[PDB]
Amino acid sequence: RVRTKTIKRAARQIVEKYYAKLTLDFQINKKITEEVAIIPSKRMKNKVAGFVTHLMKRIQKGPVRGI
Amino acid sequence: VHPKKYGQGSRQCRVCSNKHAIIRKYNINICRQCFRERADIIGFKKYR
Amino acid sequence: RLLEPVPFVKTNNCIKDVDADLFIRSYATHLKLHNKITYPKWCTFVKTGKGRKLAPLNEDWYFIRASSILRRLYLHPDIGVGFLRRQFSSKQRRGVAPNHTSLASGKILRSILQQLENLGYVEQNPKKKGRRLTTKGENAINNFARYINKKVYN
Amino acid sequence: YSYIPKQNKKLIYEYLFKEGVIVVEKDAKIPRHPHLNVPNLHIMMTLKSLKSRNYVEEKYNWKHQYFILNNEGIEYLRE
Amino acid sequence: PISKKRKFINDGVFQAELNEFLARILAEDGYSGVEVRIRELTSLVQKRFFLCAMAQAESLRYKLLKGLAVRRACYGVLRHIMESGAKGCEVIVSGKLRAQRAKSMKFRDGYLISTGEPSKRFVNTATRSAQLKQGVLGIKVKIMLPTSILPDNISVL
Amino acid sequence: IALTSKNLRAIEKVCSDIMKGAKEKNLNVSGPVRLPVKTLRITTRKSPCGEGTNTWDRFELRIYKRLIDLYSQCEVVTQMTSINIDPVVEVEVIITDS
Amino acid sequence: KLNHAVFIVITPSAIAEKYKVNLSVARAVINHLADSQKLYT
Amino acid sequence: KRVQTFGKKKTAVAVATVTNGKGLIKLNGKNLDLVEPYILKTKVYEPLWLIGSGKLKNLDIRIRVKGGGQTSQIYAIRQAIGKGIISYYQKYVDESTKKELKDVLLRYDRSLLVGDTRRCEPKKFGGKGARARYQKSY
RNA sequence: GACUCAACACGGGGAAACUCACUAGUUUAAGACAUUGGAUGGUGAUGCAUGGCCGUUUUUAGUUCGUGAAUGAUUUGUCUGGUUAAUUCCGAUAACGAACGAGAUCUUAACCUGCUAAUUAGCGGCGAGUACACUGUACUUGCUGCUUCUUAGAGGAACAUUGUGUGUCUAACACAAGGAAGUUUAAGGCAACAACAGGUCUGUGAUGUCCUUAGAUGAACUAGGCUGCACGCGUGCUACACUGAUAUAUAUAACGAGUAAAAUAUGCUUGCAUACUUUUCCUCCGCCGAAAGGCGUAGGUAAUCUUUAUCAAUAUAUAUCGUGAUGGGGAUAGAUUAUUGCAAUUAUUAAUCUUGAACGAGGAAUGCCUAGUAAGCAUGAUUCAUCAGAUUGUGCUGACUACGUCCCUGCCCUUUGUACACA
């Protein structure tokens, strides 16, 4: 399924500014990513927000390569 | 002269001046050879 | 095997509540016994349809069509001459050429329609141009439907 | 034969003059033009003849001529 | 008394006439618009019926037809596109080009999206052709209008 | 009053104008009618020569038609539409009483 | 080839093999004994 | 009082009107046994048993037939009647048995309550078959 | 014209007058311009002069830049390896950072906003009932509470979501559950870098150059071939049967597409000239005729009329037959009734009958096939004066199977060897 450089760099770009409002729940993370984002394609916004969720479940349990 | 209102010689292409491969669908009477490039100027797009 | 268990409540008020094949055969026998129409002899040497290309081989096909025409007339409030042709359209294999659907002959159905018109079972009016069945025919077919239903019930 | 009476030539000339704008159609066998009550076989030859005399220019198109009176074409063609 | 279905194809025929007529008549300047010079145009039209990519492409076609070198003409026109505002321009010219062997030169600069329906919607096209002593020249000018925002263009403030 | 076109937003905004005018003039205006969108499909093949893998492409025409009705004077509406219509949109006016 | 005739379980296939008869005359014999393919009563 | 629901699998359609009455469950004009094929009649009988003949005796269902093949029409009728009984239990007759009825319907299968998206795809290129190609020569 | 994929139901090519670039022939100037001077057109030649277009490589994933770095052609970036729809990424990295192609995005099917409503659509209510139930029903005719249902404007839902797991614990994928949606939910269209001496100047008043022009290589007119065959090779249709040959009855859809002329009368002497409606599409009707087809007509420039509360078929049930090339089979020609076409003869199209070939499921071999999909069954559109057995759009019958691999084949990378570079 994977993703592209656009998603991989959007995930790095976001979080670093509004991670506090980010929560553990997938749907709430979807909502915050959607409202901060401006990209008008909901499908790939959902894809990038799922990427964000799987990157947030990596936090608080070891180094996460940036952020 | 012997002009007839029926058959292949009843009408010819309105642009390409050749009556072969005329499409009469929807009463266009334009030859397809030119219509391939006339599709966009008429505004008749290809999507799928 | 013809009768089957039914869980819902029946009404038994018309031929719509009875199966098509049993009613059409019962009414073919009814008209054969009553002698209301002719055979007719002129239809004998013509097959049912152009696509059929062969004799039906049942000796009562005209009466079966006579019992089914008004059966479809009750079902549809308005019909046409081509309606029967389309309903009884059959396969036609033009030799080497492949099969296509084709309508049956229209003169025989026109003639039997004239026969029931003479019988009075069907009427024509400027309004509702399609064929409809008259009020007397309605109660006649209703009584016949309930009359077969009562024997086939118990 | 198809001899042209002078009436056709003078009529087409004055029809150029009064309208200022003129189209004569590339087809040749049409008996009559929607805005011209004159056979169209005898107008294509005259239009091409006048064009070849360097008095009118023709942008031209497929099955269309788009003729127009030049600033110098009227004066010679008056009489 | 005509249907809408045949009416719209009659209108399509009318616009087929109009596109080529506008292409022929609009030669000395850009695209000044259409009406629903002017006096003659209206008279002929009524008689018969009863940032500018096209302009820039016609300019380059004129520069090639006048006998000016393709390299310098293309470089100049590309500079005018860049200073007009398009993020880039894809211009390709084909023909004999001084030899008996067919050839083409492609000038690449910038993003230059080349396929996809959003690309087709954002990017406008121009392709012209003209005669030459021993052949015919073909020029293609692809101008991309500034980007709503592209889905790939992502940034967070 | 029925309007027909090919593109989407040009008739949506005109119908929005119809609705806002109806609300402003408090007319006996019936609800919007959403006719099915009809599509017309023709065929044409690429490869102008005879050789090559013959390929066939399909273009579509998406016709549109939406109806409304109002109980008012025809002159005011036939001016109001011409005020805020586009050349690519066509309308036909039919009046009603109740 | 066939050599079945009409002159001398109730399923037609079984009784046709039993009596060495054609299927049509087998159906006729079944009707005679009792008094397209169908299930049993 | 009354409820109106819908059911569509494949090209066939079905609209079901469920109303109080004496059990006049009529498919337009014809009854549910006189269709001719008993194979589909068994499937039509299937949802009746899971709910109750005594319960259905108190309600009339007006069922309309329009379009589709035999299997498609029977599936659409089954969806229409399932949604009708579920909505009527949710609305008028009784809520306590609605949960049990919907649970048993879900357990038995998924196609009884809501149909399937399985449909015909637009024809691609290559052959007469929807995924076939012409027998290329050599 | 075209010669493996990349031709051989292709040139839209289902060829009765031109039509056709061809033939037996007959005509015209219709050679613009200033006897004569003097050109356009051309289906003549050249796709080995071209443009555009297309068909391939090639539906795969490759191409390029700036800088840097390693006499030169050049190398790196563009990669050990792990994942993938793909240099798609993770990662070690003389590379780092960029542009393309990929991606992504959208129709349609698909679930929902008891949103949003009603034309030409649906659900109801009552004014009068046709007959029965019983203390409403199958069907009409007139009006309107309302719009999930006939339809659709935007939007949302779906994101490996969650949980049990593998993984350099990073990038990933598996099962199950919620969920219509777990291979991007699936078919599609856009198709680069670069090339073919592939096709097309027979598609263009797009097209250079050599060629014709009064006895035309311009145009028009009579007849003919492309439809003939000693034969060979492709795409398809019908079949070789009893799950079948055949007749009756009922249960059935989507895409659909649809209006410079007929006839009447007058003059002259059926023909020409003149004016009136619109006859110039599908057609429902009532008849004529088995049918074809005709007659006077409803409707409609179109969810209104064809016609779609309905257009087919394999099915469903009973019947003649009951696996014998048979009555399966329908090649073949003969007798003809009507339409299409001023022209059906090389019997177009066609209702009827007779005529009765092979065919026991097809060898060496090949093509298509991963789920409304194989396969079978049909239907609409195109070119049409008439004619699908062609191509395309749609619906029905819903299957046998994997859910991966390089052993065949076609492509790709790396390494290596070359005396190949038109490779």
mmCIF file of C-alpha atoms (C1' of nucleotides) in Angstrom, chain I residues 162-413:
data_model
loop_
_atom_site.group_PDB
_atom_site.id
_atom_site.type_symbol
_atom_site.label_atom_id
_atom_site.label_comp_id
_atom_site.label_asym_id
_atom_site.label_seq_id
_atom_site.Cartn_x
_atom_site.Cartn_y
_atom_site.Cartn_z
ATOM 1 C "C1'" U I 162 -9.110 -1.474 16.218
ATOM 2 C "C1'" G I 163 -7.247 -5.850 18.366
ATOM 3 C "C1'" U I 164 -3.943 -10.381 18.074
ATOM 4 C "C1'" G I 165 1.266 -10.890 14.997
ATOM 5 C "C1'" U I 166 5.736 -10.848 11.892
ATOM 6 C "C1'" G I 167 9.647 -7.086 10.620
ATOM 7 C "C1'" U I 168 16.973 -4.373 11.191
ATOM 8 C "C1'" C I 169 11.069 -3.566 16.158
ATOM 9 C "C1'" U I 170 11.976 1.821 11.599
ATOM 10 C "C1'" A I 171 9.615 1.644 6.398
ATOM 11 C "C1'" A I 172 5.951 -3.059 5.984
ATOM 12 C "C1'" C I 173 2.290 -6.835 5.452
ATOM 13 C "C1'" A I 174 -1.464 -11.309 7.930
ATOM 14 C "C1'" C I 175 -6.194 -12.906 10.484
ATOM 15 C "C1'" A I 176 -10.640 -11.429 12.929
ATOM 16 C "C1'" A I 177 -14.320 -7.704 14.461
ATOM 17 C "C1'" G I 178 -17.230 -2.924 13.573
ATOM 18 C "C1'" G I 179 -18.252 -1.527 8.776
ATOM 19 C "C1'" A I 180 -21.724 -1.839 1.962
ATOM 20 C "C1'" A I 181 -16.325 -0.429 1.280
ATOM 21 C "C1'" G I 182 -9.636 -4.324 3.627
ATOM 22 C "C1'" U I 183 -5.669 -6.507 -3.777
ATOM 23 C "C1'" U I 184 -5.949 1.907 -4.073
ATOM 24 C "C1'" U I 185 -13.312 -0.674 -3.102
ATOM 25 C "C1'" A I 186 -12.769 -1.877 -8.650
ATOM 26 C "C1'" A I 187 -12.660 -0.892 -15.316
ATOM 27 C "C1'" G I 188 -11.145 3.393 -17.206
ATOM 28 C "C1'" G I 189 -8.592 8.703 -19.430
ATOM 29 C "C1'" C I 190 -4.400 11.646 -19.283
ATOM 30 C "C1'" A I 191 1.439 8.063 -21.166
ATOM 31 C "C1'" A I 192 7.630 11.365 -20.179
ATOM 32 C "C1'" C I 193 13.022 11.009 -21.327
ATOM 33 C "C1'" A I 194 14.168 8.643 -26.751
ATOM 34 C "C1'" A I 195 13.735 6.155 -30.956
ATOM 35 C "C1'" C I 196 11.500 3.344 -35.340
ATOM 36 C "C1'" A I 197 13.984 5.482 -41.772
ATOM 37 C "C1'" G I 198 6.549 1.154 -38.814
ATOM 38 C "C1'" G I 199 1.755 3.449 -41.479
ATOM 39 C "C1'" U I 200 -0.705 7.669 -43.392
ATOM 40 C "C1'" C I 201 0.948 13.474 -48.837
ATOM 41 C "C1'" U I 202 -5.688 7.765 -50.968
ATOM 42 C "C1'" G I 203 -7.847 12.871 -44.738
ATOM 43 C "C1'" U I 204 -7.692 17.771 -45.328
ATOM 44 C "C1'" G I 205 -7.679 24.669 -50.290
ATOM 45 C "C1'" A I 206 -1.759 21.052 -44.135
ATOM 46 C "C1'" U I 207 2.218 19.516 -46.900
ATOM 47 C "C1'" G I 208 7.875 20.495 -50.378
ATOM 48 C "C1'" U I 209 9.810 18.258 -54.825
ATOM 49 C "C1'" C I 210 9.333 15.159 -60.014
ATOM 50 C "C1'" C I 211 4.255 14.500 -63.183
ATOM 51 C "C1'" U I 212 -1.192 15.877 -66.036
ATOM 52 C "C1'" U I 213 -4.142 19.836 -67.903
ATOM 53 C "C1'" A I 214 -8.618 20.332 -73.548
ATOM 54 C "C1'" G I 215 -8.196 13.800 -76.291
ATOM 55 C "C1'" A I 216 -7.509 15.892 -68.092
ATOM 56 C "C1'" U I 217 -3.965 12.318 -63.494
ATOM 57 C "C1'" G I 218 -10.740 18.375 -63.275
ATOM 58 C "C1'" A I 219 -15.649 17.266 -63.400
ATOM 59 C "C1'" A I 220 -20.184 14.551 -65.157
ATOM 60 C "C1'" C I 221 -22.603 10.366 -67.574
ATOM 61 C "C1'" U I 222 -23.901 4.012 -69.614
ATOM 62 C "C1'" A I 223 -21.985 -0.988 -68.192
ATOM 63 C "C1'" G I 224 -18.550 -3.973 -65.229
ATOM 64 C "C1'" G I 225 -14.581 -5.787 -60.327
ATOM 65 C "C1'" C I 226 -13.535 -5.493 -55.522
ATOM 66 C "C1'" U I 227 -18.978 -10.516 -54.431
ATOM 67 C "C1'" G I 228 -15.394 -15.230 -60.033
ATOM 68 C "C1'" C I 229 -11.951 -19.411 -58.107
ATOM 69 C "C1'" A I 230 -7.245 -25.273 -58.746
ATOM 70 C "C1'" C I 231 -6.453 -23.667 -53.511
ATOM 71 C "C1'" G I 232 -3.859 -21.932 -48.582
ATOM 72 C "C1'" C I 233 -4.101 -18.809 -43.966
ATOM 73 C "C1'" G I 234 -6.919 -15.313 -39.902
ATOM 74 C "C1'" U I 235 -11.826 -13.038 -37.026
ATOM 75 C "C1'" G I 236 -16.286 -14.710 -36.178
ATOM 76 C "C1'" C I 237 -21.978 -17.363 -36.561
ATOM 77 C "C1'" U I 238 -24.730 -22.420 -36.584
ATOM 78 C "C1'" A I 239 -23.905 -26.914 -34.753
ATOM 79 C "C1'" C I 240 -22.337 -32.348 -33.943
ATOM 80 C "C1'" A I 241 -27.516 -33.424 -29.262
ATOM 81 C "C1'" C I 242 -31.487 -36.376 -24.486
ATOM 82 C "C1'" U I 243 -28.334 -31.609 -18.967
ATOM 83 C "C1'" G I 244 -31.451 -32.594 -25.958
ATOM 84 C "C1'" A I 245 -34.490 -31.224 -31.257
ATOM 85 C "C1'" U I 246 -39.796 -28.754 -30.592
ATOM 86 C "C1'" A I 247 -44.656 -26.104 -28.981
ATOM 87 C "C1'" U I 248 -47.530 -23.637 -25.272
ATOM 88 C "C1'" A I 249 -47.956 -20.318 -20.301
ATOM 89 C "C1'" U I 250 -46.282 -17.101 -16.822
ATOM 90 C "C1'" A I 251 -41.267 -13.919 -13.728
ATOM 91 C "C1'" U I 252 -38.661 -10.143 -16.123
ATOM 92 C "C1'" A I 253 -33.896 -4.702 -17.451
ATOM 93 C "C1'" A I 254 -29.911 -0.930 -18.573
ATOM 94 C "C1'" C I 255 -27.482 1.976 -22.457
ATOM 95 C "C1'" G I 256 -30.676 3.552 -25.616
ATOM 96 C "C1'" A I 257 -32.338 6.415 -30.517
ATOM 97 C "C1'" G I 258 -35.905 9.191 -32.676
ATOM 98 C "C1'" U I 259 -39.931 14.856 -37.594
ATOM 99 C "C1'" A I 260 -33.895 21.362 -49.710
ATOM 100 C "C1'" A I 261 -39.202 17.302 -49.972
ATOM 101 C "C1'" A I 262 -44.634 13.959 -50.962
ATOM 102 C "C1'" A I 263 -49.285 14.569 -52.892
ATOM 103 C "C1'" U I 264 -53.446 17.736 -55.208
ATOM 104 C "C1'" A I 265 -55.195 20.962 -58.934
ATOM 105 C "C1'" U I 266 -54.664 24.241 -63.602
ATOM 106 C "C1'" G I 267 -52.650 25.212 -68.625
ATOM 107 C "C1'" C I 268 -50.568 23.025 -72.940
ATOM 108 C "C1'" U I 269 -50.670 17.969 -75.306
ATOM 109 C "C1'" U I 270 -49.474 10.351 -68.707
ATOM 110 C "C1'" G I 271 -44.922 14.493 -69.696
ATOM 111 C "C1'" C I 272 -43.098 20.075 -68.469
ATOM 112 C "C1'" A I 273 -44.455 24.809 -66.093
ATOM 113 C "C1'" U I 274 -47.064 26.977 -61.700
ATOM 114 C "C1'" A I 275 -49.469 27.455 -55.740
ATOM 115 C "C1'" C I 276 -51.358 25.397 -51.395
ATOM 116 C "C1'" U I 277 -50.276 21.501 -45.434
ATOM 117 C "C1'" U I 278 -45.651 19.379 -44.741
ATOM 118 C "C1'" U I 279 -45.506 13.906 -46.755
ATOM 119 C "C1'" U I 280 -39.038 13.873 -46.072
ATOM 120 C "C1'" C I 281 -38.125 9.549 -37.784
ATOM 121 C "C1'" C I 282 -39.606 6.355 -34.675
ATOM 122 C "C1'" U I 283 -44.739 5.245 -35.001
ATOM 123 C "C1'" C I 284 -49.578 3.250 -30.919
ATOM 124 C "C1'" C I 285 -54.387 2.374 -33.306
ATOM 125 C "C1'" G I 286 -58.630 -0.277 -36.768
ATOM 126 C "C1'" C I 287 -58.445 -3.034 -40.661
ATOM 127 C "C1'" C I 288 -56.269 -5.400 -45.599
ATOM 128 C "C1'" G I 289 -52.662 -9.413 -46.330
ATOM 129 C "C1'" A I 290 -49.952 -16.245 -42.781
ATOM 130 C "C1'" A I 291 -46.263 -12.695 -43.379
ATOM 131 C "C1'" A I 292 -43.665 -9.165 -45.822
ATOM 132 C "C1'" G I 293 -45.817 -4.920 -46.573
ATOM 133 C "C1'" G I 294 -50.131 -0.993 -47.249
ATOM 134 C "C1'" C I 295 -54.079 2.008 -45.947
ATOM 135 C "C1'" G I 296 -56.355 7.104 -42.731
ATOM 136 C "C1'" U I 297 -54.617 8.330 -38.273
ATOM 137 C "C1'" A I 298 -52.924 9.281 -31.836
ATOM 138 C "C1'" G I 299 -48.041 11.099 -29.765
ATOM 139 C "C1'" G I 300 -43.675 13.363 -29.648
ATOM 140 C "C1'" U I 301 -37.722 18.508 -31.510
ATOM 141 C "C1'" A I 302 -38.940 13.946 -26.737
ATOM 142 C "C1'" A I 303 -38.809 10.554 -18.118
ATOM 143 C "C1'" U I 304 -45.044 12.985 -21.923
ATOM 144 C "C1'" C I 305 -45.394 9.275 -27.988
ATOM 145 C "C1'" U I 306 -42.665 4.767 -29.985
ATOM 146 C "C1'" U I 307 -41.606 2.738 -24.647
ATOM 147 C "C1'" U I 308 -39.786 0.953 -20.632
ATOM 148 C "C1'" A I 309 -45.799 -1.076 -14.218
ATOM 149 C "C1'" U I 310 -41.380 -2.983 -19.717
ATOM 150 C "C1'" C I 311 -37.981 -4.795 -25.386
ATOM 151 C "C1'" A I 312 -34.786 -10.678 -25.275
ATOM 152 C "C1'" A I 313 -32.930 -15.071 -24.157
ATOM 153 C "C1'" U I 314 -30.895 -19.140 -21.893
ATOM 154 C "C1'" A I 315 -34.428 -20.686 -17.540
ATOM 155 C "C1'" U I 316 -39.493 -22.137 -15.076
ATOM 156 C "C1'" A I 317 -43.836 -26.441 -16.063
ATOM 157 C "C1'" U I 318 -46.259 -29.910 -19.061
ATOM 158 C "C1'" A I 319 -46.319 -32.033 -23.315
ATOM 159 C "C1'" U I 320 -44.604 -34.942 -29.545
ATOM 160 C "C1'" C I 321 -40.103 -37.240 -29.412
ATOM 161 C "C1'" G I 322 -36.485 -40.261 -26.190
ATOM 162 C "C1'" U I 323 -29.207 -40.413 -28.535
ATOM 163 C "C1'" G I 324 -30.866 -44.205 -34.296
ATOM 164 C "C1'" A I 325 -26.453 -38.627 -38.063
ATOM 165 C "C1'" U I 326 -32.752 -39.407 -36.283
ATOM 166 C "C1'" G I 327 -37.554 -35.770 -36.586
ATOM 167 C "C1'" G I 328 -30.778 -33.205 -34.415
ATOM 168 C "C1'" G I 329 -27.937 -30.499 -38.385
ATOM 169 C "C1'" G I 330 -29.036 -26.427 -42.032
ATOM 170 C "C1'" A I 331 -24.983 -26.013 -46.310
ATOM 171 C "C1'" U I 332 -27.792 -26.069 -51.339
ATOM 172 C "C1'" A I 333 -30.927 -24.752 -55.194
ATOM 173 C "C1'" G I 334 -35.899 -24.375 -57.025
ATOM 174 C "C1'" A I 335 -41.435 -22.041 -56.823
ATOM 175 C "C1'" U I 336 -42.841 -16.875 -55.190
ATOM 176 C "C1'" U I 337 -45.600 -12.849 -52.091
ATOM 177 C "C1'" A I 338 -44.061 -7.247 -50.564
ATOM 178 C "C1'" U I 339 -41.020 -3.513 -49.108
ATOM 179 C "C1'" U I 340 -35.598 -0.569 -49.876
ATOM 180 C "C1'" G I 341 -33.677 1.438 -54.099
ATOM 181 C "C1'" C I 342 -35.818 5.509 -61.694
ATOM 182 C "C1'" A I 343 -31.675 0.255 -61.448
ATOM 183 C "C1'" A I 344 -31.858 -6.669 -56.352
ATOM 184 C "C1'" U I 345 -29.516 -9.673 -63.036
ATOM 185 C "C1'" U I 346 -23.831 -11.171 -59.430
ATOM 186 C "C1'" A I 347 -31.327 -14.059 -57.516
ATOM 187 C "C1'" U I 348 -29.621 -7.369 -51.764
ATOM 188 C "C1'" U I 349 -33.855 -7.203 -47.833
ATOM 189 C "C1'" A I 350 -38.020 -10.966 -47.278
ATOM 190 C "C1'" A I 351 -43.378 -14.091 -45.159
ATOM 191 C "C1'" U I 352 -44.254 -19.674 -47.271
ATOM 192 C "C1'" C I 353 -42.684 -24.668 -48.894
ATOM 193 C "C1'" U I 354 -39.508 -28.189 -50.833
ATOM 194 C "C1'" U I 355 -34.609 -29.502 -51.331
ATOM 195 C "C1'" G I 356 -31.093 -32.839 -46.423
ATOM 196 C "C1'" A I 357 -23.729 -31.909 -47.138
ATOM 197 C "C1'" A I 358 -20.403 -32.782 -43.331
ATOM 198 C "C1'" C I 359 -20.797 -32.835 -38.380
ATOM 199 C "C1'" G I 360 -19.609 -39.383 -32.740
ATOM 200 C "C1'" A I 361 -16.703 -32.598 -29.598
ATOM 201 C "C1'" G I 362 -11.740 -31.751 -33.625
ATOM 202 C "C1'" G I 363 -4.341 -34.306 -34.509
ATOM 203 C "C1'" A I 364 0.654 -31.867 -34.560
ATOM 204 C "C1'" A I 365 -0.607 -26.599 -31.825
ATOM 205 C "C1'" U I 366 -2.433 -21.974 -30.179
ATOM 206 C "C1'" G I 367 -5.426 -17.762 -27.948
ATOM 207 C "C1'" C I 368 -8.393 -15.724 -23.247
ATOM 208 C "C1'" C I 369 -9.020 -16.354 -18.191
ATOM 209 C "C1'" U I 370 -8.099 -14.204 -11.288
ATOM 210 C "C1'" A I 371 -14.862 -12.630 -9.579
ATOM 211 C "C1'" G I 372 -21.359 -10.200 -11.878
ATOM 212 C "C1'" U I 373 -14.890 -11.618 -13.945
ATOM 213 C "C1'" A I 374 -14.156 -17.132 -17.320
ATOM 214 C "C1'" A I 375 -18.142 -19.125 -20.231
ATOM 215 C "C1'" G I 376 -22.961 -19.009 -22.196
ATOM 216 C "C1'" C I 377 -27.460 -16.068 -23.344
ATOM 217 C "C1'" A I 378 -29.247 -11.986 -25.444
ATOM 218 C "C1'" U I 379 -30.198 -6.240 -26.337
ATOM 219 C "C1'" G I 380 -29.143 -0.703 -27.886
ATOM 220 C "C1'" A I 381 -25.781 2.621 -30.962
ATOM 221 C "C1'" U I 382 -22.472 3.299 -35.449
ATOM 222 C "C1'" U I 383 -21.884 3.253 -40.903
ATOM 223 C "C1'" C I 384 -28.037 3.008 -43.314
ATOM 224 C "C1'" A I 385 -31.990 4.333 -49.421
ATOM 225 C "C1'" U I 386 -31.722 -1.451 -47.725
ATOM 226 C "C1'" C I 387 -28.677 -4.957 -45.337
ATOM 227 C "C1'" A I 388 -24.656 -7.227 -38.938
ATOM 228 C "C1'" G I 389 -22.762 -12.752 -39.027
ATOM 229 C "C1'" A I 390 -18.458 -6.337 -37.978
ATOM 230 C "C1'" U I 391 -16.961 -2.850 -33.712
ATOM 231 C "C1'" U I 392 -18.850 -0.649 -29.567
ATOM 232 C "C1'" G I 393 -22.758 0.395 -25.037
ATOM 233 C "C1'" U I 394 -25.855 -2.598 -21.642
ATOM 234 C "C1'" G I 395 -28.397 -6.475 -19.112
ATOM 235 C "C1'" C I 396 -29.337 -11.945 -17.574
ATOM 236 C "C1'" U I 397 -27.661 -16.831 -16.388
ATOM 237 C "C1'" G I 398 -23.012 -16.493 -11.457
ATOM 238 C "C1'" A I 399 -18.871 -21.266 -12.473
ATOM 239 C "C1'" C I 400 -13.685 -25.338 -11.699
ATOM 240 C "C1'" U I 401 -9.641 -23.289 -9.245
ATOM 241 C "C1'" A I 402 -5.357 -20.452 -7.230
ATOM 242 C "C1'" C I 403 -4.159 -15.544 -4.054
ATOM 243 C "C1'" G I 404 2.265 -17.427 -6.003
ATOM 244 C "C1'" U I 405 6.694 -18.410 -8.999
ATOM 245 C "C1'" C I 406 10.676 -17.922 -12.481
ATOM 246 C "C1'" C I 407 10.772 -23.897 -15.132
ATOM 247 C "C1'" C I 408 8.646 -21.875 -20.620
ATOM 248 C "C1'" U I 409 7.861 -17.093 -22.936
ATOM 249 C "C1'" G I 410 8.183 -11.507 -23.151
ATOM 250 C "C1'" C I 411 10.606 -7.568 -20.623
ATOM 251 C "C1'" C I 412 14.291 -5.293 -16.425
ATOM 252 C "C1'" C I 413 18.752 -4.723 -13.377
#
